[PDB]
Amino acid sequence: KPRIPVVWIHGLECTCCTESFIRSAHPLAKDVILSLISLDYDDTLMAAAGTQAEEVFEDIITQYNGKYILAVEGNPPLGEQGMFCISSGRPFIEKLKRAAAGASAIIAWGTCASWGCVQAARPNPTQATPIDKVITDKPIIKVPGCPPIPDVMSAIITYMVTFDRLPDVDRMGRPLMFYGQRIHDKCYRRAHFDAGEFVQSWDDDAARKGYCLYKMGCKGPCTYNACSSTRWNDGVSFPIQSGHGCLGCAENGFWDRGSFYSRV
Amino acid sequence: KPRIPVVWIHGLECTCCTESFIRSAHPLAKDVILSLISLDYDDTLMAAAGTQAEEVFEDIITQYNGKYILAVEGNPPLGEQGMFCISSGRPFIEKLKRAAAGASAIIAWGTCASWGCVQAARPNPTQATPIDKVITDKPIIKVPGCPPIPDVMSAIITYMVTFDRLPDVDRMGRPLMFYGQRIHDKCYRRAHFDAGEFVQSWDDDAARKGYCLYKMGCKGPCTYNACSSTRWNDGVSFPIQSGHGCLGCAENGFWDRGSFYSRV
Amino acid sequence: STQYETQGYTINNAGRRLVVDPITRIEGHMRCEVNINDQNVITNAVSCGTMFRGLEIILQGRDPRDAWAFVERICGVCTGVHALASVYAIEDAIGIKVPDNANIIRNIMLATLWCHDHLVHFYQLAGMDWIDVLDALKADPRKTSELAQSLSSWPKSSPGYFFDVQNRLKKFVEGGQLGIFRNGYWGHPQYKLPPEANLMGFAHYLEALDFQREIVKIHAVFGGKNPHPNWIVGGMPCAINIDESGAVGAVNMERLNLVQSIITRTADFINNVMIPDALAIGQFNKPWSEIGTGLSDKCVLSYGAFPDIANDFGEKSLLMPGGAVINGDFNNVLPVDLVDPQQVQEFVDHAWYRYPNDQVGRHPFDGITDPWYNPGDVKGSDTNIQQLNEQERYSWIKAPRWRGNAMEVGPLARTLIAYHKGDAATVESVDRMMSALNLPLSGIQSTLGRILCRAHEAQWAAGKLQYFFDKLMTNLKNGNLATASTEKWEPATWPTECRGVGFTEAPRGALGHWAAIRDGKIDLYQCVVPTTWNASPRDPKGQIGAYEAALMNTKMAIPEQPLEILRTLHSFDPCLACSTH
Amino acid sequence: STQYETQGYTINNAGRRLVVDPITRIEGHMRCEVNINDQNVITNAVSCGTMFRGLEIILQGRDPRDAWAFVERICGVCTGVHALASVYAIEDAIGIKVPDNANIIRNIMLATLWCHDHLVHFYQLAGMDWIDVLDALKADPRKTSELAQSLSSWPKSSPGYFFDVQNRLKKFVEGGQLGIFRNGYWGHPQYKLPPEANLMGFAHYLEALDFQREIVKIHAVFGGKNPHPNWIVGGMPCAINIDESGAVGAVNMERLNLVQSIITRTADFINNVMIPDALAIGQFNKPWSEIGTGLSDKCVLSYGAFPDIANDFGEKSLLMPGGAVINGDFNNVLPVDLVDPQQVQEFVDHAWYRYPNDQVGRHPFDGITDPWYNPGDVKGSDTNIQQLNEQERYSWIKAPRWRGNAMEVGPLARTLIAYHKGDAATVESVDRMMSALNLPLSGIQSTLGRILCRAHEAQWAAGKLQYFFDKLMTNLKNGNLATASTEKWEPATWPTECRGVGFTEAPRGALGHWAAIRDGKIDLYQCVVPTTWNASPRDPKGQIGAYEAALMNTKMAIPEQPLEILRTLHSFDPCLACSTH
């Protein structure tokens, strides 16, 4: 049977969300691409460049108008008439708007597409702007995190393909399945938090016993994500398990909530 | 470069500790057997049977007297003159004592070798007895659990090979590295326990959100093991993560501490 | 010495007595003795279980909801199967019906076990009876690659790979530290593989030792851990949440994706490594299609397994057929009833137990587990068995019979029952397999046949994993998430007195747990386990069980080296902890 | 049109202009323009970074301890290297010395990234320039097996495997949904592999896509996650506990065991899949040993990396050598000083930035990032560029120079520096590689040489992973567990005004972060990143950067199909988010 067309575009970004996607353990990103979806445009991976890539973009959004999913990594800058991000000699935002207009739905991968992420941190030199403030007439599913968890990205994809529907979302457009609870409400160090058992300086005796990172600035109490349950890289670890507090990286404006080492 | 000789014997058992050992993800059990130890006797895996297996046993404990590690799975029954467990026509306890006499140290794998496990539960028909109540003049490392975590077993083996020393132990002979803390002091559902957020009956709304299993009889608060941190089967799950309370299976006498479904 | 006739055999304890104690490459503790005649042919065979723990005694007074956790520890090899039989037995006693997803997930747990257990048996337990590991050091790596590529699409076949495996084995043995290979039977004339086949099989032994760890990740997702996953009376505790807040705390789409990835890899390993290896053992060891028939052409038993209609244990529901054949009459597959007191009975006249009358067999609802270590004259002492006395009590294993008949259970038994019931997939698979070996159908009724059927079953179970997974996903797509029924969780809801049977097909054969509940506690818990059938001692009529029959009439090339005995016993996949419990 | 001479090139912008925008199979946003003469030879090349975010502006006023987390997000491909450069810079400014285990673990993080990044670049980014994916459908699976087995011991080589991969590709394209293969350059005359080598390479593309996810498990153990692991000023947050209570909460023996298992698997994949494929591309594409030389026979630069003596960044400590060569004089490897205002300087006369004097270069401690989008007299308009005007400002990339010289950085640059400094392992590796190709040493100074050196470096880094792991374990055996120095963690302990340099060799070349701290806050934070060097626009003397030079004098078979431009650009592994930050 034909696979669902997907167009994956890139604005201002670091490409962490593409890299996260290809880490997927189950299904492998290989199997997502060969068997689950038709990844019809993606600057990072496609053979064609230049005029050949422009022909792919135009052919897919025309032939599959109304029928493709648009994945967005990164975000558009409004500064300098949009020419902080140039694609085919024109502002990126024009490509975002053309791709959005034909899409059935939009996946905003990462904190960049969802909220703004690092380029939007003060003083936001480029006026980097999240997708939902530019595209106001399409369903947008926010999948935040810098980047999101690989097997969360692939589970959201498999949910959509298998169940033939968007995931149910919270009031911010995040999938309830992975963003319904806070890091701190599924954290294996919560016993230590409840007991007042805290790391006070790096590599102290508390640190060597896996005590709570709250006094080292952990933002798990105000951050919604699946890192403390699903974990990272085929379940191997997450920030807190390896001894660093949560930075808050799945939350809007997390770069500007103060030092990562200042307590909540 | 010779490998350290290991003799692995089996008393009354279910073979869950051998099975756990071969699950090891890192190092693979293959690489433990080929590169890290010389597994010179093991009834579950060895080519020789009968008189040929008796010759291997006698040859290894004689040639390597004072220099092999004895691994013990299962336990000796004192009932019926020891003939609830017969090996080469004689009580298993005789083989245990011969193997112990030549060993430099003993690893008591699992709750059976450490404490008694299921055959020692009331009314203990066979008078199944843990290794340390029979062998009283040798270092015994207890690695309890029914069975212990695969990658805990292999981590203890690699520790001993790499560091050329026994692990440091608690007052019960359990390695501090994996048995120093309780399941409940590293449980990812502790937030729910703190909040009074409990499963009250199987598959209720609380169960479907991963709430605490204390009211369903979880024995995590009185059990020392690594399940809530290292987890099981290459970090894939542990009892509580899959929705059942801890049975208490690493602790002495856990079968007889009341119904698994009665709260602590 | 004495001689008597039973089941077409002449049981003759004249001649040289051979003892094999311990039997290795099994689970748990077994002793075997034989007598051989002047042509080195076995004329007597004695099967002895050399352990006992007493789970039927320990279970008395327990809460029925806890029973599964205790009886799971009957065995860590067939881990989970006793938990399944237990929750089936308690649900049968109380009158509990579980939701479809719980039944589907239990079937996934059982099919996962069949795959894992059969794979490890083939390679780590039986394999070294057929593969001469030391002879692999003489193989040509290029000829090994050619052989492998002629048999399978499996990727891992390069000459360099086989040279690297061979070199690893060479370095391993060079210092004299042969480990599990010490004092083996290497060079015995019954090792018939060429060196290239030995190196291919050894490489696959190592690949299977690695890969088997992955299969049980399915048990970790639904059951928390393996060995010894968790279960509940009323379904499973692995609550499902796909699309709601808190799915991080439940079986969610990421957890199900992990299960799917393991299913695919499990099928690929079994279909492209173990299946071709099993067929190659058959090609190079055809005479073993005529050795170890035993009771497999006389009396075979299956209870059936894998109910596809939740809470329906009838013939239209069970995906793995049940039935009995006796007296070699495969044209009449008989129905089995585990409540009928005239069907399953256990004798103890030749076992270390007391009954008020040891000349009669007890149905398990009338079962008694009163241990009595009484070996009589064993040419040594009670603590020094030099020769078991098979005229009196000689085992910790009870003697189960079906309508008084001695039966074989396990993969070959199940294959023969499904074949003769006219199951289309089975008939076609068996006929194609025996055609490829250029052997008649009767060649399956043998030690080689037990191995071929076991491998075939691993393939069948890997297919059924996908079928069950797809059934679970269909329910989830239809919004059917339920995994537990709790209407009768509380003891106040139970009958004051009730009894039930839980049955299934474990990797080694027909399993039943019989439970009687009174006043909220276990009053009686009796287990009859597949190796109890196969490894059975004699009964009051002198009838021999499946192991003793299969060893009868067997030629030994070298009496002091029991390779033929090991081949046939290992072909049944003995689990002695299971047999004795 | 204009013509001028620079660095031995004739820069001539007469004649046909070709535009490639977007450049794909890179990180980030790049535009390339060229002019070609009547003979289809490039006479002008224009490198344009088409993105900017402004991390150097965003960092002002932040706490120096937070800076690593911000600058890590310069790039998710070379993830972690900017965090390493950052903690180095802040430690250099404040006067912090980390414990040995923290330095060893940082070296492991960097070597892990080299392995991962180089492997993905080879297959997923550059590979389809060399491998004709659709031509793999014409291969013979058995001839593919025979080819693979002639080149490698890698196990996965069976004819059935190559048939299965070929059938997966055949099914993929059968519905007309060619995905990432759509409208490619397939059948271009510069595709020279035979069908069997295309199918071998495509199978390996897929194996590498799968395998790369495992490598970064090392980052997850020590750094929590990949992409974008965590770090601290003072060391690493991954506290170690091997033998004490609470080791479950720390880097323990089980976590170290997982790292060791990934190291072995990573070396095996690189040595037996990536290395023989790189050599095979060399064997079938020898003419590309003479294409794309650019600056690689004139000016190359390495800062050096992997200090083996903790907190010692000198020549006796750095395992990957530093040095600069200019004027093609490889007999004179010059030392690099990142504080010397006369060495590293950035120019913006041809970039979208404001300086007080755009005719001079500014050392990064005097750096200015004042963005000014001013493309001037383009063909088209400022929001609809048809042709950049390379006579004025044409890029978001600043123009770094070393002592005024335009330099190439990256794997070829480092290989040349280490070779000409006499590093024994580099000399042996390079000599053996070029001997196997029957090519002169000069053949590495090319587009093919960039790819060969990158593969070399993945093997070098895999070996160093084991070395660093063993050093860490030696410390732990000696009871040396420390991972952080915290005596200068608190801002009150810092100098009121200080500055520092943090430098390393990222996968793509020489990286530096220059940081000034005043009154507890970042006063200045300037980054010069490897793709900033290589993708540089021109300077006031008209000197061209590494990409523009390497494209000069290139023949194109089909002007409308930029395969030769993509081959040379991809050989440098462009990261445009890095270049612009």
Ligand code: SF4
């Ligand atoms: S480490 Fe962070 S998320 Fe975990 S319990 Fe402490 S404050 Fe909460």
Ligand code: SF4
């Ligand atoms: S689930 Fe058990 S171990 Fe976890 S918090 Fe609740 S009671 Fe404690």
Ligand code: FCO
């Ligand atoms: N399979 C199995 Fe174990 C036995 N015999 C059970 O039941």
Ligand code: FCO
């Ligand atoms: N490698 C890499 Fe990224 C670039 N250029 C950095 O630093």
Ligand code: SF3
């Ligand atoms: Fe993930 S491209 Fe990387 S910066 Fe934070 S999400 Fe963006």
Ligand code: SF3
């Ligand atoms: Fe682990 S052999 Fe299995 S019963 Fe509990 S440990 Fe014993």
Ligand code: F3S
């Ligand atoms: S920093 Fe991000 S990756 Fe998870 S633990 Fe915190 S949301």
Ligand code: F3S
């Ligand atoms: S039952 Fe046992 S396996 Fe761990 S979670 Fe509890 S100690």
Ligand SMILES: [Cl-]
């Ligand atoms: Cl943000």
Ligand SMILES: [Cl-]
């Ligand atoms: Cl116990």
Ligand SMILES: [Li+]
């Ligand atoms: Li029922």
Ligand SMILES: [Li+]
């Ligand atoms: Li320093």
Ligand SMILES: [Mg+2]
């Ligand atoms: Mg019984």
Ligand SMILES: [Mg+2]
């Ligand atoms: Mg800069």
Ligand code: NI
């Ligand atoms: Ni068993």
Ligand code: NI
């Ligand atoms: Ni980069």
